[PDB]
Amino acid sequence: GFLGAAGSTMGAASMTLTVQARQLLSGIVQQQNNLLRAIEAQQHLLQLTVWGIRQLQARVLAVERYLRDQQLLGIWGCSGKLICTTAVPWNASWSNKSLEQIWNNMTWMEWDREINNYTSLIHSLIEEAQNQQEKNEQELLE
Amino acid sequence: GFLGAAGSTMGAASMTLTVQARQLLSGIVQQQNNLLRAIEAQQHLLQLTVWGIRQLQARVLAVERYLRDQQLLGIWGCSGKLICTTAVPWNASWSNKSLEQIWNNMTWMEWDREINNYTSLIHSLIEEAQNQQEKNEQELLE
Amino acid sequence: GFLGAAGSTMGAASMTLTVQARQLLSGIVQQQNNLLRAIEAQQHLLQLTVWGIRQLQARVLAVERYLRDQQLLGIWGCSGKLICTTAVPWNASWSNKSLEQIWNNMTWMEWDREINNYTSLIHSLIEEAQNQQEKNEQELLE
Amino acid sequence: KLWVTVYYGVPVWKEATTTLFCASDAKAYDTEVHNVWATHACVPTDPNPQEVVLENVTENFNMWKNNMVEQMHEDIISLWDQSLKPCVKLTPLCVTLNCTDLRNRGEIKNCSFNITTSIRDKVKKDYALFYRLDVVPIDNDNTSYRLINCNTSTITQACPKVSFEPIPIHYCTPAGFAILKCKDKKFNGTGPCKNVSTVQCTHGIRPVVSTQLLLNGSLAEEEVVIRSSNFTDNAKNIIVQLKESVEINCTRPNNNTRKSIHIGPGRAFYTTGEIIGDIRQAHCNISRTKWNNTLNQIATKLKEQFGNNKTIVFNQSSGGDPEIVMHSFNCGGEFFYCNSTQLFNSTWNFNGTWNLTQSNGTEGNDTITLPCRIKQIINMWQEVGKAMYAPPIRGQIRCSSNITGLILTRDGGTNSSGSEIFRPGGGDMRDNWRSELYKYKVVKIEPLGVAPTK
Amino acid sequence: KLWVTVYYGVPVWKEATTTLFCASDAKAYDTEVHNVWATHACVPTDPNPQEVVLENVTENFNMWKNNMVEQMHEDIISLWDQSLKPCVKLTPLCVTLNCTDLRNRGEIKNCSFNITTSIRDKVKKDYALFYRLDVVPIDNDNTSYRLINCNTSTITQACPKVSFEPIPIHYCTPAGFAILKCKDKKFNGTGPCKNVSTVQCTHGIRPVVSTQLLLNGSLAEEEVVIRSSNFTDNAKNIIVQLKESVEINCTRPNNNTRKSIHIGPGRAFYTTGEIIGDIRQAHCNISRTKWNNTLNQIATKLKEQFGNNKTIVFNQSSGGDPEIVMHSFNCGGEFFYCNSTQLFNSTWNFNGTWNLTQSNGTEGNDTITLPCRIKQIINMWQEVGKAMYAPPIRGQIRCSSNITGLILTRDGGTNSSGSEIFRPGGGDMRDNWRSELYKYKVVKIEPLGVAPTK
Amino acid sequence: KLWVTVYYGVPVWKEATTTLFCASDAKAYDTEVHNVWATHACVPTDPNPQEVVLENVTENFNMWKNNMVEQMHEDIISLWDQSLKPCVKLTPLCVTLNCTDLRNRGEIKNCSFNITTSIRDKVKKDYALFYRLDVVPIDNDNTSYRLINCNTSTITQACPKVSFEPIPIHYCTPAGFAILKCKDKKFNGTGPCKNVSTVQCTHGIRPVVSTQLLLNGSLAEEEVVIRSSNFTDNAKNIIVQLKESVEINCTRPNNNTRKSIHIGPGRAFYTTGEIIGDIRQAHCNISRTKWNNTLNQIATKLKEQFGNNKTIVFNQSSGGDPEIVMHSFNCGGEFFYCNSTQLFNSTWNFNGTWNLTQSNGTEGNDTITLPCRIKQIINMWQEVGKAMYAPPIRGQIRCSSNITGLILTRDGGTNSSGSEIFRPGGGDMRDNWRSELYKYKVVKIEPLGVAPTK
Ligand SMILES: CC(=O)N[C@@H]1[C@@H](O)[C@H](O)[C@@H](CO)O[C@H]1O
Ligand SMILES: CC(=O)N[C@@H]1[C@@H](O)[C@H](O)[C@@H](CO)O[C@H]1O
Ligand SMILES: CC(=O)N[C@@H]1[C@@H](O)[C@H](O)[C@@H](CO)O[C@H]1O
Ligand SMILES: CC(=O)N[C@@H]1[C@@H](O)[C@H](O)[C@@H](CO)O[C@H]1O
Ligand SMILES: CC(=O)N[C@@H]1[C@@H](O)[C@H](O)[C@@H](CO)O[C@H]1O
Ligand SMILES: CC(=O)N[C@@H]1[C@@H](O)[C@H](O)[C@@H](CO)O[C@H]1O
Ligand SMILES: CC(=O)N[C@@H]1[C@@H](O)[C@H](O)[C@@H](CO)O[C@H]1O
Ligand SMILES: CC(=O)N[C@@H]1[C@@H](O)[C@H](O)[C@@H](CO)O[C@H]1O
Ligand SMILES: CC(=O)N[C@@H]1[C@@H](O)[C@H](O)[C@@H](CO)O[C@H]1O
C-alpha cells in the first residue's frame, strides 16, 4: 500500500503509514540501476541535457524536502518514530465535529481541510508548547 | 525575543532559548513570499546575477551549518531537545569561579570566553565519554 | 584506533567503534586549515580546476552518504547512539554457525559476508518490524 | 478531549507540479546505438517498479492542465540540441547548387554543387541527389537553385549516425512525488478517477513525432474515445482514441545512396548518391475493412449533438503548413510524410452500414493505396533557426507504423447547427503528447497530519 | 560540582561576515517595469519581518570595516552587467560623426553620422543630437569629432527600456545570521551600541548613485553628525549627517526627442532628436533659509578642535575628475549633475548668526539658483571599459531629490592649526554606501553553549 | 537465540574508488610563488594527520589497478590547463623566422623573426636565440626555418612567471574514505599486506615529470625491488626500486638571457637573448662506485629466471620518441633531458664483482660524465595540440636530482630463453606515477553491521 489502504479512514490510514512510507521512499533502488555511466551497450554520446541534470535536480529538491522534514522532527523532539504526540489541544477553531467521525469520514483529508488553517494554526504552538513549555510524563506515585 | 531577553544571564538566557530559536529560523517564510519567478507585475528580464545565485548560496551555506548541528546532535545522542546533559565535568581548566555567578554575571559569554578553549577543551571528551563510556541513569533500588 | 583495534573480533571491534568513528570523521579540521583563500604567501592565480572543485565534490558526495546514514537512523528510530537493537531475528538463512564464534572468528566480516545477502535480507524487515510492528519493552509487573 | 495529535508517514496525495526523470529499460541500454535519436546516460527503468492500484479512492485529473507535457517537450528539445552539438556543420555545404531534373512532378534531380575541403584553397566539386524541397528555383535572377533552409538560417548535419528511430522511454518521479494514474478507459482529460493506481515511474511510451495522428502509441480499449479541450470551440482540436489499430505501409521501394564525403577536418557529409535501377516513387497500401469498422465506430462515437443521429462530415484541411496539413513522422531517420487524402472523402452520417465494406466481398480498389512522401530537413516544435540534414538510409525505406489516435478540428467557417464538419488539424503538436497523459497526474505525498485525538 | 552542561538554542551573537540577500517589497514587484535599473526575480520582503529591539545589551559596530558595502557594490555590478547583456550594441554607432554647433558654451550641436542597417551593404545616414561630452574635436587632423568613449573601448546601448530610477531594496540575512542594528542617532561607525535591535532583514534603502552628496536616503535625526574614518587624516573624507533635508529642483525645462531607429536585426538606437521650441539650458532653484540653518548646524557641529570656537572654512575642490569635483546622480535615466559651487562660498566661523537669513525678510537673490548639467554615458565604480548610452526621456526632465548627508575632505595643502579647510571630496564612492551602514552589523547566532552546572 | 542486532561506528574497510583531494603543507603556502607549476588555493595539509598503523590486519593491494593514478593525472591536466589560461598567447610569434647558425652540432643559432606590436600596423623586428628543436629547415622550398610546433597547432606562452619546480603535494581522502597504506618494503603492486596503516591523507610526494626514471621520489629501503605488471610480457615495463640514490648533476654551465619584450596589449615574450662569454654545452658528472653497487644489486635482483644465475643484459632503446628513448624532466622551468647512454653498456651477468669498482682505486674516467640536453616546448601526457614556450632562467641552470627508481622493457625481439635483455622503456608515463602507489589503497569505511546476538 504505497498510497492506498485509506479511502476514508483515520485508523486504517494510520496503520498503513509504514507501508506507505517504505513504498514511497523506494526510488533509491531505481537510481541504483542507472547502468547509465556513458553508454548503453556499444556507443554513445554525452547527451547530458538540462533534462537529466534537472532529473538529479528534482531529486535534490525532493530529498531536501525530506531533510526539512527531519529538521522539523528535530525541532519538536519528534524524530523517534511516526508515533509522537503534541502538548497542544485542538482549538475550538475547527468546527464542532465528532472526533471518531472526523477519523472515519474525514479520510484525514476532510478534518485537515476544514482544520486546514486550523491544523496549521495548531502547528506553530508545538515548538514552544512541547519544547518551550516542555513537561515530562504523568505525575503518579509508587 | 529573537536574541534579546538575555543581557547578563544564564538562567533567563536558558529559558528564552526556544523563543530565540523560533525567531531565528523564521527566514523560510521570507523565502516563501519570493513572488520572484520571472517578473514583478508586467515585464522583466533574467537579471539572475551572482548576487542572487549567492543569496541562495549563502542560504545553502547557513542551512548546511544547521545540518552539521543536527549531525553533532546525532553523534552525542543529544538530538531529543535543547535539554541534554554531558557525562563530562568542567575541568579545573577554567579559573576558579562561582558557578551561579558565572551564570548571572557571565551572560553565558564571559564563562564561555575564559573557558573558551576550556569550553572546547571540554567539548571533544563528550563523544567518547557520553557515547564511548556510555552509562545509563542512576543506580537505585525499589 | 581509526580502523584497527579489530583484526578478528566482534566484541573488541564493537568496543572500539566510538574511537573509529571519531578518528574517521576528523577531516573537518583538515578542511579548516585550508589557508587556501587566494594565495599561499605572496602571489597566486585562480588555479581552481576540476581537481579541486571535485575535491569539494567528493567531500559533498561522502557527506551526503553520512546524511543518508542519519536518515536511515531516523527511519528505524535508531538515532540515539551506536547501541540500538532490532526486532528482527537472524533467519536460518545464514548457515549453521556458532554466534560467539561468528563473533570471534568472523571479524564481523565473515559473518557479514556469508550472511551478506542474508544480512541485507534481514535488513529490510526492520522498518516494518521495528516501526510497523512496533512494540515497547518487556511485559513485567512491579 | 480532542487533544491535537501529529502523525507521520500518513497517506496523503496532493497536486504535484514537479520535474520528472528519464527512464529507459534494459532493452534500451542493449540497443547499442550510441544514440538512436532518444537514449542518454540517464537512469534505466528499475526491474520491477511498484504500481499500487488504489481502489475505493478518487482522483481528479486534467491532462491538458498537466504540466508533464511541458517538461517532456523541453527535455526533448534540450536532448536534441545537445545531440546536434557533436554533429558536423554544413555551412559551406550551403553554397549555391545547380540541380538537373533528370527524373522527370518527380522531385528527383541530381544536384552538383561545390563542397569545400580541409585546406582553405583546395576545393573540389561534388554532386548529390536533392529533392525539390531542399532547394528552390530563383525567379528574381533565375540563375540556379538555393536551399530554402540556407537563405534563412545556418545549415548543419543531423548526426547521420544518430538514427531517428523511436525507443521506449520511462518517466520516473522524484522521492516523495508520485504519479497517480487513472485506470479508466472512458476517462477524459479533466475528470475524476476511482481507478487510481499510484505509479512511481510512469509506464513506458513511444514518442514518435507525428502530425494529426499517432504512431506506435498507447491504445485506448473497450471503446472509441473522442475528446477535445473545447468541443464547442471549433478551433479546438478534436482528439480521438480509436479502439483498434491499422497496418500502415509507409515503405519506399526505391533504394538510397550514401556518399560519405569528408568535408572538414574530420567532418563528412552523406550526400544522397544515385539510385540503382529505375527510380520510382514511394507508395503505400493500407487495409480497408478494419478502417471502415473504426470509421463506423467514430461516426457512431461522433454523434455528440448530431441532429437526429446523423451529423458526421469530414473534409480535407483547407491548407496551410506542410506539417499541419498532412501526417508527418520519422521512421529510420527519413522523415516520412504518408499523405491523408483518403480519410477526408467519406461520410457515415445516415448509415454507418451503407459505407461499410465486407471483407469476403472486398472490392477491387478496396486496399487503400495512396502516395507517400519523405523529407531530409526538419524544424522541431516549429522553431525557425539552424536546420539539419537527414542522411540517406542506403536501402529500401520500410516503415511499419500503427494507428491508435486521431486529431480533428471542427469547421468554424460553416453552419453552426446545419452539419458538423471536422477537418484534419495538426496545429497543436502537444495534443499528440497529451493523448496518453489523461490518466497520469504527478501527485505529491505529505506525511504530516494533524488530528484531534483523545 | 561544576558538571559541564551543554545547551542549545542559546542566545548568542558573534561577528558575522557573510553574504546578504536581496529583498524588494510588494510595491516593488508592482512597479511593473521589466527592470527599472534595480529590480530582479529576487525574493520580496516578507510582510512583517521581526526587528527585535535588544535592550540592556551592548554591541560594538564598525561601518567602515563592515563587509556589507563590498557585497552590495559587487552585486550591484553583477546586476548591472547582467542587465547590460540583453541591451543592443552600438559598435557601428561608433563611426565618426560630424556635429554642427547649431545652438551657440551651449553643448547642443546636432550631430549627423553614419548608422548602419540590417544588410551588410545597405547603409543610410542619420543625425541625432550629441553634447560636447560624447565627442571631442580632433586637433591632430581636425577632420571631425570622435566619441571619447569610442576611441578608448567598445560602445553599447544602456537598455533605454530599463530606466535608471531608484527603487526600494531590502537586504535579508541567511538562516542563523542576524543583522544587529544600532538604534542610536549619535552612533558613529566604529562604536559600541546599547540600542541593539536584531534585524533579520535590514530596513529598506534607496541606493541612488550620487557623488559628494546623498539623494533620498536615511535621515539622521535629533542632531547633525559629522564623522570621518580619520579626522586628523585630511585626505579622509568627512562624512556628515544633516539633521533636516532640502528641496532640490534638478529639473530641465527643455524637452527631449527620441528617434527610435532600427540599426541591427532587432536592435534600435534612441538618438536624441531635435528639441521643439527655443532650446534653453537646464536650471535649478534651491531654498535658502533651511540651508542656512543646517549650515549653522554643521559649523556648530564642525567645531571639533576649532581654535576658540571659530575655525570653519569651506572651499571648492581644486579640481579633478568630473565625478569627484561635482555632484552627479541618476534621475529618470538621465544622469543629472547639478553643480555645487554655491556651498563652497560661505563661512560660519565667527557668527553662525551673521550668515543666517530671515525667511520673512528673505533677500532678493536668496533662492539658490545655479546651472544644472546632465549626461548620456557613464562608467560605474570608476571602471574603464565598454561604455553605455543613455536614451532620451522625451520630456521635460523633472528631478526632485532631497538631502540627508554630505562628504568633505579636509585640506592638507594648508596650515595645520591655522584654519580648518574642508573641500568637497567625491573620491570614495563607498562613503556614500556606508553612511547608512553604521548601525547594521551582520551578527552570527550560535546555539551551542557550555557551562558548569551542578 | 541469534537475535539479529545492528551496530554503528563498526570497524569496516571496503574497496574504495573515489576522488582524492589536494593538500600542500604550510611550507607550500610559504613558497610565496603565485604558482610554481604546482600550488593552488587548495586545502593545506593538516598540522598532524592520523596514520593509524593497523597490525594483525590484512589488506590486498593492486597499484596498477588503483584508480589514484587516473584522478592524479586528470587533475594535473586540469591544473596545467587552468594555469595556461592566464598566460599570454604567441600566435603572432608563430611567424616565420630566419635563424643564423652562429655557434657552429651545437643547436645554438640566433634567430631573428618578426614580433608584432600593440597597434595593427606598427610592427618591428626582433631576434632571440632558438635551438634546432623549436624550428626545422624546410626542404620543400628551403626558404627559412619553421617552428614544428607552429605548423601543426597553435602557439602560446608557458607562463614564464610560473616556474616548473617540484613542490610537495598531499592527497587527502573524503570523510568516510580512508587510504589503507601498506607498510611493507618488498610489498609489490597486486599483493596483500599486514602492515596496514590507515591514512586519512596520503604522505607528501614530489611529482617531478620524468621519463624512464625517478627524480626526488619515495625511496624503497632494505632491498632492491624489480616489479612489472607482467614479467613474461616483454612489452610490460619493468619497474625497479633501487635501494639507494645517486647524485645527479644536470647542470648547464652557460648562462641564459631573457629579453622581456612586450608583444600584445599587456603580453610579453621572454625571448632567449645572447649568452655572455664563450657559449659551451651543458655537461653532467655522476658518481661511479655507488652506481656499481646498485647495479650489482639489481643484477642480483634481476636474477628472476636467470639461467644458472647469469642472465642479465641491458641494451639501449632501439629508438623512438624523444620522451621515451631518453630521460626527460623539469628543473627550474627548463625541461632538462640528461641522456642515459652510460647505463645500457654494462653487464653483471657472470660476476657482479667483475664489474664492480673500488672507490679507493677509482679509475681515471670513472666519474660518469655524459652530455646533458634541455628544451623549451613540451606536450604533457603525449597530447598533440596547442604548445607552450619555456622562458629563459637567466642564469647557469643547476639541477640536482636524485635516483630512487627505474623502468625497463624486456626485449621481445630476441631469444626467449637464451639471454634476458632489458631495454629502457619510457612508453608508459603512469608507471612513474604508480611506483609510489603500491601501498596506498583508497579504502571505504562502513559503520553498518549485522550480527546475530543473543
Ligand atoms: C460525517 C460523515 O461522513 N458521516 C457519515 C454518515 O452520514 C453515514 O451514515 C455513515 C455510514 O457509515 O458514514 C459516515 O461517515
Ligand atoms: C562577577 C560579577 O560580575 N559580579 C557582580 C558583583 O560584583 C556585583 O556586586 C553584583 C551586583 O548584582 O553583580 C555581580 O554580577
Ligand atoms: C571458525 C573459526 O575460525 N574457528 C577457530 C578455531 O578453528 C580455532 O581452533 C580457534 C583458536 O583460537 O580460533 C577460532 O576462531
Ligand atoms: C473502466 C475501468 O475502470 N476499467 C479498468 C480497466 O481499464 C483495467 O484494465 C482493469 C484491470 O482490472 O480494471 C478496470 O476497472
Ligand atoms: C495488398 C498489399 O500489398 N498488402 C500488403 C500486406 O500483404 C502486407 O502484409 C502489409 C505489410 O504492412 O502491407 C500491405 O501493403
Ligand atoms: C539615542 C537613542 O538611542 N535614540 C533612540 C531613537 O533613535 C529611537 O527612535 C527610539 C525608539 O524608542 O529609542 C531611542 O533610544
Ligand atoms: C522660487 C522657486 O522657483 N521655487 C520653486 C518652488 O516653488 C517649488 O515648489 C520647488 C519644487 O521643488 O522648486 C522651486 O524652485
Ligand atoms: C617488511 C615490513 O613490514 N617493514 C616495516 C617497515 O617498512 C617499517 O618502517 C617498520 C616500522 O616499525 O615496520 C616494519 O614492519
Ligand atoms: C668530479 C665532479 O665534478 N664531481 C662533482 C661533485 O664534486 C659535486 O659535489 C657534485 C654535485 O652534484 O657534482 C659532481 O659533478
Numbering used by the authors:
A (entry chain O), B (entry chain B), C (entry chain Z): 521 to 662
D (entry chain N), E (entry chain A), F (entry chain Y): 33 to 136, 151 to 500
Sentences from the study reporting this entry:
A total of 32,802 sub-volumes were used to reconstruct a C3-symmetric sub-tomogram-averaged structure of hVLP-Env with local resolution ranging between 5.7–12 Å and a global resolution of 9.1 Å. Classification of the sub-volumes did not yield any other distinct conformational class, indicating that the hVLP-Env were in a predominantly closed, pre-fusion state. The Env ectodomain connects to the membrane via a thin tripod stalk. In contrast, in hVLP-Env, Gln-653 forms the distal tip of the HR2 helix, making the helix length 10 amino acids shorter. The remaining residues in the C-terminal portion of HR2 helix bend and form a thin stalk connecting the ectodomain to the membrane. In the presence of membrane, we observe that the thin stalks, corresponding to Env residues 654–664, form a tripod that elevates the ectodomain ∼10 Å above the membrane. As a result, the bulk of the membrane-proximal external region (MPER) (residues 660–683), which is a desirable vaccine target of some of the most broadly neutralizing antibodies (bnAbs) of HIV-1 isolated to date (Gray et al., 2009; Rantalainen et al., 2020), is primarily embedded within the membrane in our structure. However, in our structure, only partial density for the HR1-C helix can be observed corresponding to gp41 residues 570–577 and 582–595. In contrast to most available structures where density near to glycosylation sites often covers only the core n-acetylglucosamine (GlcNAc) sugars, in our unliganded hVLP-Env structure, extended density for glycan moieties is observed across the protein. Thus, the tripod stalk of Env is flexible in its membrane-embedded state, allowing differential sampling of MPER and other membrane-proximal epitopes.
The envelope glycoprotein (Env) on the surface of HIV-1 is an essential viral entry machine that mediates binding to host cell receptors and subsequent membrane fusion. Env is translated as a precursor gp160 protein, which trimerizes and is cleaved into gp120 and gp41 subunits that are primarily responsible for receptor binding and fusion, respectively. The gp120 and gp41 subunits remain as non-covalently associated heterodimers with gp41 embedded in the viral membrane via its transmembrane domain (TMD) and the C-terminal cytoplasmic domain (CTD) in the viral lumen. As the sole target for neutralizing antibodies, Env is also of singular importance for vaccine design efforts.
